[PDB]
Design an enzyme around this catalytic site. Structure first.
Site, short mmCIF file in Angstrom:
data_model
loop_
_atom_site.label_atom_id
_atom_site.label_comp_id
_atom_site.label_asym_id
_atom_site.label_seq_id
_atom_site.Cartn_x
_atom_site.Cartn_y
_atom_site.Cartn_z
N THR A 134 4.44 0.49 3.97
CA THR A 134 4.81 1.32 3.52
C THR A 134 5.31 2.90 4.13
O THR A 134 4.89 2.93 4.82
CB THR A 134 3.29 1.86 2.51
N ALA A 191 -2.15 1.01 -4.75
CA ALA A 191 -1.55 0.82 -6.21
C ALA A 191 -1.48 0.83 -7.24
O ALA A 191 -0.46 2.01 -7.95
CB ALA A 191 -1.32 -0.75 -5.75
#
Lengths: 213, 238, 228, 201, 199, 204, 239, 248
Positions: free
Chosen positions: D1, D49
């Site tokens: 990420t 998420a």
């Protein structure tokens, strides 16, 4: 002391076609080192164009299925129409987040047809994030199926090979080959293979046997 | 006239007038006729226009896959009982995983409408529900009333000038148990045409027919599919 | 027995909501027409003062980017109904990723107007016209204080309501176009209002399938009036 | 990420990767980590998420009602503040959220940073993610306020590539958005393996 | 972790803080402000957690302004300081405790300048000088060495510059820039920013 | 412990017709002082004081809550408060937080409002009253304060020797403590006047 | 006949108890207000001091926030609740959303708080009408007004109180489409408008202006006396 | 008619129940405060002074409330004890919150918002009590305020009560002073005003009451002065009548 979760196994496969969608799962229900039954499919016909699969903890799978089927009727008499494929994935994300601090132990895959007549596969997590994909494989044997479908469907790591779209008949034998290879190395997979095909003419079903050990 | 103000106040004749006035709101709505055979229960209603080019107000509305109801009376009490009706139908699907028996669902309505006919602070429900359904023992035709009484019957007509429809049903009720849907439906809509003034005819744009069957889910036909039902009819003897 | 929402009549009826229908009559006129090319909509302003700022008088509000609105009667109760009608279209998009249909907007609106004495207040004093283009094409609906909901093809409400309806039923047919229905609508307006029709007495609002924007006309309205 | 954002003379540049994992298992490679809130606002996804997916969708639910009630778009400082108060009520319960807010305003550009812990700060350059610390050095060596438009496209595309090289939890594709005065515009989306043939050659 | 200082004079209050908004290794922002103008003669310095600094201090910020608009006049620095202590202690034995450290700086027309100290357990104090953070240890004994109760506002800036050079020398964190205010009978005046060429 | 977070020492001592009370001046966190002017003795009416010691939060909190209830008492009744009545008032306030208790131990000293009769008492952190006739002590350095008062106290003492006894008891015991010191203030009251003196102590 | 309730309707559709609340507004002192190029201005009349009281507690002009004003009519008790409530909302808006409060947002709060206060029985509505003047929303001068029914509305020049019909008819023939620049000219418009007072004593006018950047500037009875002198200077051209 | 609950409005249009309460206070006691530099005073009247009572409190009209403020009272006694126990409880809530006394204006508005709130919520009476205010603060010094049943208030320099003693307000203007406002100049004005309004002649000391408030060394003592020095204050005014007739 009391623990509220247990793992039951299962393997769910979905492939978005050009004008179709194929949902496949095994029918083995197990717990620990015992087999409860050899006939328990994970396919659920929600509408005439949408089939959902539910793996993970089986007590939450029976609950979450009946909540969605109630809200299908609640949508319809309020709107005089049925839900789309994308509307169910938007509704399911709010239901999964509604118990954020006591989560469902369920992996979800929704496959079906959109309003244009094409395939659509939505994958999920136990908290409620989703995205539209072309093919996903959820469950206990999820790691044994994703690299092979990247080679055959996605054509990844290949050289000098054209990108022909996957036909219906070629997609059937790819599903029948991955579950034979997965039932060899995984212990939570076998005893049958329920396959649901969603087209513009309805929903077909087909059952292929596997090894029974 | 001083006794004619509240639901709580009894009369020196022993008749509460507020319940007697909610019967009069049922006669404001249009007529609707329900009946049944051994296998099929069909209720037929009559639409009413508001203006010359607005859509006609619907009467028959779907409830469950084996239950459909008609309406006569206040539209405020109509959808208020419908939302109570749909909630009870899906609770038995969620808990018991079976459809409701039709005879015990209506007993929940009489318990529902009894409280606002006794306690002060809420008027009685001005409503004329006709109910058709399928439990495990065949079809049923039910009616309710704002006096919270529910009547099992084999044929019934309620609404405006519905007495002339009752006279047609009494002299043809012996024929209803045997005939099938091609004439059982048009046994019913021959009863609506006496609840009309004698100069206009039952057209395709002002009538609804709902059929639930033993092997047939409850289906509402209106304005396009009434034409296979209105074919093969005689006129009025004028 | 004519001063209570909890009391019937010997004949029917209320006798309270019937008085609420009368509160619409002292409003301003408003005309909406459904056409296969889209839904046009007209209204009369009745501006009192020149110092009175004109754009602070609303008669067309934007419920959503494909749904317009029109109102008459009591202004105070109207702003309550417009508020949740914007919220219910917004809650539906949050949980479904789609636009709420024009019919099912008013389902949410009518569920609260029939709550005036049916909890465990007074009924409202405002009629509404809802125009919009959903997936079933262009639509035009109508409601009332009694919660009675219906679909209309061409509707005129407010003051001069009945006098507009007789002339409006004369010229309407199924095969209209949008630009024909706009100039047909304000022929009716200058026959039912008392002041001379100009660019400051009225305002328009249209909606189209591919032109879901522009529920307003901004001094193109001067072009329509000068060619009457 | 790995996400980053920086503003300059001609607006704001937003870039991110597309890899989402699960432990040591890669779930997908086509995750869209830049959430399109409005035609004039953008939000990122960094840490969790569904946590970044839900609350920014709830923020987009709130900014539309503010536009209808007041006939005017919301400001950038307003939307970052509304997001900070919603997350702060669930402090300590175990949320994870490190998103960024971008968009043009009447005051000009806009760039705020919102944590799940409660940090709401403004700034000029930011980089959020597990491989964020690999992106600060290569960006600041080439950052200037007076960079060109094509130069700023190559700087952020370089910086994501160096972050996905060293980090193991970063890869996939490189998305790239551009916030103009009227609204945001999608620039491109390039694979990392295509950039490896371009940069090393 | 971050630094404050509270030099009190005979008719002035000299305050300064740092401008660092770091995240666990990196330094995301190097021009951060920790100074909150409560009113026209009262400042506020806040050091604490991530969200607890902004949420609580703005709750005090938008509550003293309510007193100004409603009563027509302004709070004293003593009453404003003794209201902030009331809100921590009431919201301490609850599910949401606020973990911040404060110091208040105000001037009064009748009482002159004033300084107040605040713990994260809501303990008031009246100090001739105060500090917070890990840098409070290395610097206050310097300020304890050269303090005079009758000191000019020019020597206080020079004493502040002596106080910060040792924090540049034997303190592990970076801390390059330091914003400085001053409060007198005229109001809050903004002095020039303080930076350090190290070598 | 929580009591050892800020330190403190409060002593009261009964004389012949008078009563004295003393406390320290140091305010500070566990090992770092802050200031030397922290008030721990609060006047509650004339010829009647109270001393608080323990956690510095609950010292400033209870002294405001008790002042909240005292002024409402002295307006419904035109009289002042008796020293027995205040002890029942404080014990009610501490017992309401039975399981959320304040971390302080109050010491009440004062004279009778009608006669000249002195009164001393001390309470626990949950409100156990305890009246004596010679002395009461509270704070962190309690055991050092018992060693000085058991040897120096005399029954009938003028205000001259009573001041000199409570001075030597506070100086020699607090200098043995580490987290208490930095100055000692002494209040000595009587029927005619109130005398407040500060002592020359070690500032280390 | 039938009123005696805020929930019942007339046979021709009226709410007389709501309409009677507007009759209580006409017992108040008149207050006018115009907007201009940069400087907004509002003035009140009918001070009428009574020889034995302090006059700083009879103030009719207050500020909700730093850049919004307030003038009212009606009865003094109900205005104090609305003013004290609106100070909270224009301060709590700043806490939840870090912007300053627009002049449009605070008028919707006052109207909606007066809205729900009319619906339920046993709640006597507010018998006040208010003028909200503020050049706050990004350099744009605006002024709105309220109503006891709860309808916020925007004018460009306003008059209320006992004798509003004469002043509102006066300003329509006086407010030029020529924008009143050189803002002492715009202040002289209000003093000419307030010259048609119920008695026009001259020293009973309390004009308060705002130059859209500073705070409120309450005028003194020496600067306002200078503007009353130049109004008589222009009146010398009649002969 | 329109003599129902406080809701509703009358047509044309006003509030009859509020007007009935504001006329009820004229048939009650008599209270007044006067101007003073470096001080303030109150004066009241002893009603029903029958010879079988005790007066164990020796303060009936006057209630010392915080530390530097007191108040008179006029109206229904059942509502009088409710307000005074409420009003003392406001000032200690402020003192717990800021550790500073309440500055003598927003104490009054705190009560006036309570007294108003019974005129809009049904179904309650309004308070049939008007009362005065005396006090000192940091910002303005000595002050006077006048409560009303409607919740309206106002500052004053000299005021009184209505239909009992509304003619005293005409006397306060006719014998008005400004600047020369010492306490002894005001106490001589007080016994002259109560002479005419209290219609019982010669003004016995057991029918009156005088309470003062000064500012001494930063303490603000409050005096309810005893009956012995009322005597030499009355006989001073009785002497001034015999001196005033020398012009005749």
């Amino acid at each position: 002391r009391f623990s509220p979760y247990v793992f039951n196994g299962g393997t769910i496969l979905a492939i978005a076609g050009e004008d179709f969608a194929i949902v496949a799962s095994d029918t083995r229900l197990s717990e620990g080192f015992s087999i409860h039954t050899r006939d328990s499919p994970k396919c659920y016909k929600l509408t005439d164009k949408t089939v959902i699969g539910c793996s993970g903890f089986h007590g939450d799978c029976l609950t979450l299925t009946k909540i969605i089927e109630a809200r299908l009727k609640m949508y319809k008499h309020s709107n005089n129409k049925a839900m789309t494929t994308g509307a169910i994935a938007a509704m399911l994300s709010t239901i999964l987040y509604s118990r954020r601090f006591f989560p469902y132990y369920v992996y979800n895959i929704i496959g079906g047809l959109d309003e244009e007549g094409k395939g659509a596969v939505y994958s999920f997590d136990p908290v409620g994030s989703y995205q539209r994909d072309s093919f996903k494989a959820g469950g206990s044997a999820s790691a044994m199926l994703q690299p092979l479908l990247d080679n055959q469907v996605g054509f990844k790591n290949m050289q000098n090979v054209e990108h022909v779209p996957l036909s219906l008949d070629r997609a059937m034998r790819l599903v029948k080959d991955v579950f034979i290879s997965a039932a060899e190395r995984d212990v939570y997979t076998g005893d049958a293979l329920r396959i649901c095909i969603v087209t513009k003419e309805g929903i077909r079903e087909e059952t292929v046997s596997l090894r029974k050990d | 006239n001083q006794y004619d103000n509240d639901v709580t106040v009894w009369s020196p004749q022993g008749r509460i007038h507020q319940i007697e006035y909610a019967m009069e709101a049922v006669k404001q709505g249009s007529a609707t006729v329900g009946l049944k055979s051994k296998t099929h229960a069909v209720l037929v209603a009559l639409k009413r226009a508001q203006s010359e080019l607005a859509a006609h107000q619907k009467k028959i509305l779907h409830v469950d896959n084996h239950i459909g109801i008609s309406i006569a009376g206040l539209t405020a009490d109509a959808r208020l009982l419908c939302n109570f009706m749909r909630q009870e139908c899906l609770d038995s699907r969620f808990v018991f995983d079976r459809p409701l028996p039709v005879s015990r669902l209506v007993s929940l309505i009489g318990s529902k409408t009894q409280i606002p006919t006794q306690r002060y602070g809420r008027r009685p429900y001005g409503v004329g529900l006709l109910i058709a359904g399928y439990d495990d023992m065949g079809p049923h035709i039910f009616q309710t009333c704002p006096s919270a009484n529910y009547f099992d019957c084999r044929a019934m007509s309620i609404g405006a000038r519905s007495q002339s429809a009752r006279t047609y049903l009494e002299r043809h009720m012996s024929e209803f148990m045997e005939c099938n849907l091609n004439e059982l439906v048009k046994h019913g809509l021959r009863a609506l045409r006496e609840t009309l003034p004698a100069e206009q005819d039952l057209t395709t744009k002002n009538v609804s027919i709902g059929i639930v069957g033993k092997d047939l889910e409850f289906t509402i036909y209106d304005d396009d599919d009434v034409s296979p039902f209105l074919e093969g009819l005689e006129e009025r003897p004028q | 027995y004519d001063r209570g929402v909890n009391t019937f009549s010997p004949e029917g009826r209320l006798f309270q909501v019937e008085y609420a229908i009368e509160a619409i009559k002292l409003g301003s006129t408003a005309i909406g027409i459904q056409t296969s090319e889209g839904v046009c909509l007209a209204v009369e302003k009745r501006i009192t003062s020149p110092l009175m700022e004109p754009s602070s008088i609303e008669k067309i509000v934007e419920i959503d980017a494909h749904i317009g609105c029109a109102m008459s009667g009591l202004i105070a109760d109207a702003k309550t109904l417009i508020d949740k009608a914007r919220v219910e279209t917004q809650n539906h998009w949050f949980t479904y990723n789609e636009t709420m249909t024009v019919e099912s907007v008013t389902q949410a609106v009518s569920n609260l107007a029939l709550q005036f004495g049916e909890e465990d207040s007074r009924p409202f004093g405002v009629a509404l016209l809802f125009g919009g283009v959903d997936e079933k094409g262009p639509q035009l609906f109508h409601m009332d204080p009694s919660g009675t909901f219906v679909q209309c093809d061409a509707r005129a409400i407010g003051s001069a309501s009945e006098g507009a309806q007789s002339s409006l039923q004369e010229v309407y047919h199924k095969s209209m176009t949008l630009k024909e229905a706009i100039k047909s609508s304000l022929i009716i307006l200058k026959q039912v209002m008392e002041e001379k029709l100009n660019a400051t007495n009225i305002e328009l609002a249209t909606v189209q399938p591919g032109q879901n924007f522009h529920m307003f006309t901004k001094e193109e309205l001067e072009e329509v009036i000068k060619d009457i | 990420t790995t996400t980053l954002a920086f503003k300059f003379r001609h607006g704001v540049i937003v870039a991110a990767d597309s890899r989402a994992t699960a432990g040591a298992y890669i779930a997908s490679q086509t995750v869209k980590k830049v959430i399109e809130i409005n035609p004039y606002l953008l939000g990122t996804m960094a840490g969790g998420a569904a946590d970044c997916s839900f609350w920014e969708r709830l923020l987009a639910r709130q900014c539309r009602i503010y536009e209808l009630r007041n006939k005017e778009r919301i400001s950038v400082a307003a939307a970052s503040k509304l997001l900070a108060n919603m997350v702060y009520q669930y402090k300590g319960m175990g949320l994870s959220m490190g998103t960024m807010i971008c968009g043009w305003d009447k005051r000009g550009p806009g760039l705020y940073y919102v944590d799940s812990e409660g940090n709401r700060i403004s700034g000029a350059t930011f980089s959020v993610g597990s491989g964020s610390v690999y992106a600060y050095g290569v960006m600041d060596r080439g950052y200037s306020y007076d960079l060109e438009v094509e130069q700023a496209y190559d700087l952020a595309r370089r910086a994501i590539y160096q972050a996905t090289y060293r980090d193991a939890y970063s890869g996939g594709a490189v998305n790239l958005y551009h916030v103009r005065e009227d609204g945001w515009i999608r620039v491109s989306s390039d694979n990392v393996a295509d950039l490896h043939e371009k940069y090393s050659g | 972790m971050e630094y404050l200082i509270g030099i009190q004079g005979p008719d002035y209050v000299l305050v300064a803080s740092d401008r660092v908004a770091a995240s666990n290794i990196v330094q995301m922002k190097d021009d951060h402000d920790k100074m909150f103008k409560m009113s026209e003669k009262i400042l506020l310095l806040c050091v604490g957690e991530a969200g607890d600094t902004v949420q609580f201090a703005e709750y005090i910020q938008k509550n003293v302004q309510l007193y100004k608009m409603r009563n027509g006049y302004e709070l004293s620095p003593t009453a404003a300081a003794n209201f902030t202590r009331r809100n921590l202690a009431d919201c301490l034995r609850s599910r949401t405790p606020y973990h911040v450290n404060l110091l208040l700086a105000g001037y009064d027309e009748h009482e002159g300048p004033a300084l107040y100290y605040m713990d994260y357990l809501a303990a008031l104090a009246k100090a001739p000088f105060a500090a917070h953070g890990y840098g409070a240890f290395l610097t206050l004994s310097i300020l304890d060495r050269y303090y005079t109760p009758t000191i000019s506002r020019e020597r206080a800036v020079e004493l502040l510059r002596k106080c910060l050079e040792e924090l540049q020398k034997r303190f592990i964190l970076n801390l390059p820039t330091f914003s400085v205010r001053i409060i007198d009978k005229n109001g809050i005046h903004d002095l020039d920013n303080i930076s350090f060429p190290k070598q | 412990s929580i009591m050892s977070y800020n330190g403190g020492a409060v002593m009261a001592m009964k004389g012949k017709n008078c009563v004295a009370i003393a406390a320290d001046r140091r305010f500070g966190i566990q090992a770092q002082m802050v200031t030397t002017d922290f008030q721990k003795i609060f006047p509650m009416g004339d010829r009647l004081y109270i001393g608080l010691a323990g956690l510095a939060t609950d010292v400033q909190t209870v002294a405001q809550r008790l002042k909240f209830r005292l002024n409402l008492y002295e307006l419904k009744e035109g009289r002042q408060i008796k020293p027995y009545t205040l002890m029942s008032m404080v014990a009610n306030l501490l017992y309401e937080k039975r399981f959320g208790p304040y971390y302080t131990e109050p010491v009440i000293a004062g004279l009778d409002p009608k006669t000249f009769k002195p009164f001393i008492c001390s309470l626990d952190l949950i409100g156990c009253p305890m009246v004596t006739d010679d002395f009461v002590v509270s704070g962190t350095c309690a055991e050092q304060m018992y060693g000085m008062c058991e040897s120096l106290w005399e029954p009938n003492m003028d205000p001259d020797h009573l001041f000199e006894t409570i001075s030597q008891a506070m100086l020699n015991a607090v200098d043995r403590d580490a987290v208490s010191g930095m100055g000692v203030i002494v209040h000595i009251i009587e029927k005619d006047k109130i005398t407040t003196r500060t002592l020359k102590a070690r500032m280390d | 006949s039938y009123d005696r309730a805020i929930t019942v309707f007339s046979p021709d559709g009226h709410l007389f108890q709501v309409e009677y609340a507007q009759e209580a507004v006409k017992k108040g002192s008149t207050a006018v207000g115009v907007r201009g190029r940069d400087i907004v201005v509002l003035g009140v009349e009918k001070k009428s001091v009574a020889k034995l009281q302090d006059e700083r507690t009879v103030r009719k002009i207050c500020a909700l926030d730093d850049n919004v004003c307030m003038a009212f009519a009606g009865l003094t008790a109900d205005a104090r609740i609305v003013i004290n409530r609106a100070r909270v909302e224009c301060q709590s808006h700043r806490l939840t959303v870090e912007d300053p409060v627009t002049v449009e947002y605070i008028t919707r709060y006052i109207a909606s708080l007066k809205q729900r206060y009319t619906q339920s029985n046993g709640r006597r509505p507010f018998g006040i009408s208010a003028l909200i003047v503020g050049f706050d929303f990004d350099g744009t001068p605006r002024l709105y007004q309220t109503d006891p029914s709860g309808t916020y509305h925007a004018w460009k020049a306003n008059a209320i109180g006992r004798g509003a019909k004469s002043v509102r008819e006066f300003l329509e023939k006086n407010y030029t489409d020529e924008a009143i620049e050189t803002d002492d000219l715009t202040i002289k418009l209000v003093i000419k408008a307030l010259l048609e007072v119920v008695q026009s004593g001259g020293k009973n006018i309390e004009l308060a202006v705002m130059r859209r950047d500073q705070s409120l500037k309450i005028l003194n009875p020496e600067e306002i006396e200078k503007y009353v002198a130049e109004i008589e200077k222009e009146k010398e051209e009649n002969e | 008619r329109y003599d129902s609950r406080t809701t509703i409005f009358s047509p044309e249009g006003r509030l009859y129940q509020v007007e009935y309460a504001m006329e009820a206070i004229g048939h009650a006691g008599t209270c007044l405060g006067i101007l003073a530099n470096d001080g303030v005073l109150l004066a009241a009247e002893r009603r029903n002074i029958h010879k079988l009572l005790d007066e164990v409190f020796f303060s009936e009209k006057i209630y010392k409330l915080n530390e530097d403020m007191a108040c008179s009272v006029a109206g229904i006694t059942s509502d009088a004890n409710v307000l005074t126990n409420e009003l003392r409880l406001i000032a200690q809530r402020y003192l717990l919150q800021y550790q500073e006394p309440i500055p003598c204006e927003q104490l009054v508005t705190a009560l006036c918002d309570i007294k108003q709130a019974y005129t809009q919520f049904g179904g309650k009476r309004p308070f049939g009590v008007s009362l005065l205010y005396i006090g000192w603060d940091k910002h303005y010094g000595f002050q006077l305020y006048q409560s009303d049943p409607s919740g309206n208030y106002g500052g004053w320099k000299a005021t009184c009560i209505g239909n009992n003693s509304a003619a005293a307000v005409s006397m306060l203007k006719q014998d008005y002073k400004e600047g020369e406002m010492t306490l002894k100049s005001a106490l001589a004005l007080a016994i002259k005003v109560l002479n005419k309004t209290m219609d019982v002649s010669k003004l016995s000391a057991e029918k009156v009451e005088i309470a003062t408030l000064t500012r001494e060394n930063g303490k603000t003592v409050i005096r309810v002065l005893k009956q012995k020095e009322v005597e030499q204050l009355i006989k001073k005014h009785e002497e001034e009548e015999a001196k005033a007739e020398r012009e005749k």
